[PDB]
Amino acid sequence: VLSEGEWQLVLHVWAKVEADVAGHGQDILIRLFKSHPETLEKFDRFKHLKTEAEMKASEDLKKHGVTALTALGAILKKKGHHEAELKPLAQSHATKHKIPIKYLEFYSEAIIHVLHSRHPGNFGADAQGAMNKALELFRKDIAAKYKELGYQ
Numbered sequence: 429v430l431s432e433g434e435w436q437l438v439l440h441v442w443a444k445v446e447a448d449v450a451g452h453g454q455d456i457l458i459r460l461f462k463s464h465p466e467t468l469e470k471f472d473r474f475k476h477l478k479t480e481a482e483m484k485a486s487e488d489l490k491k492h493g494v495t496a497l498t499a500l501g502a503i504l505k506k507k508g509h510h511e512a513e514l515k516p517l518a519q520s521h522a523t524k525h526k527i528p529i530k531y532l533e534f535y536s537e538a539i540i541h542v543l544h545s546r547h548p549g550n551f552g553a554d555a556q557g558a559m560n561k562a563l564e565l566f567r568k569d570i571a572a573k574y575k576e577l578g579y580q
């Protein structure tokens with residue numbers, strides 16, 4: 429359980445991301461894809477992208493980034509009581525898209541790296557710790573649903 433102060437830190441910085449959801453989304457997906465090339469293969473839509481310049485030039489990649497960050501935003505703003513938002517996403521990711529939990533760990537790392545690049549002054553160590561806790565709780569809850577559905 430995050431404290432109310434921890435949730436404040438998380439949502440304070442999230443409100444900043446929301447100034448440019450598209451840019452954040454591109455930066456996060458590109459970081460994910462470059463740091464963890466196996467992740468790019470899960471996306472039929474994007475596996476044609478072979479360079480960072482091509483990734484940055486993809487309007488469709490930017491669209492998916494906005495989709496994913498907008499869903500994450502909705503979950504964060506539920507502060508832990510996120511079960512209705514999280515449940516559909518766990519299902520689709522386990523059953524349809526077939527994303528390992530470990531990939532969700534890589535995605536969290538990419539989020540944190542970006543947030544630190546774009547918001548140093550609203551993302552010091554306390555806010556980093558808080559965000560990490562939030563993203564861990566997300567992954568914990570996703571994992572529990574994965575276990576229920578038999579996804580490994």
Ligand code: HEM
Nearest residue numbers: 467470471472473495496499500517520525527531532535
């Ligand atoms: C913060 C973590 C994540 C969020 C919030 C998120 C959110 C979303 C949302 C909202 C969609 C569209 C609705 C759906 O199908 O459920 C989606 C689709 C998708 N997600 Fe994620 N996702 C996350 C992590 C990942 C990761 C780590 C991968 C792959 C490594 C992944 C692969 C996909 C794919 C393949 C689709 C289908 C997109 C398409 O081909 O049209 N997701 N995700």
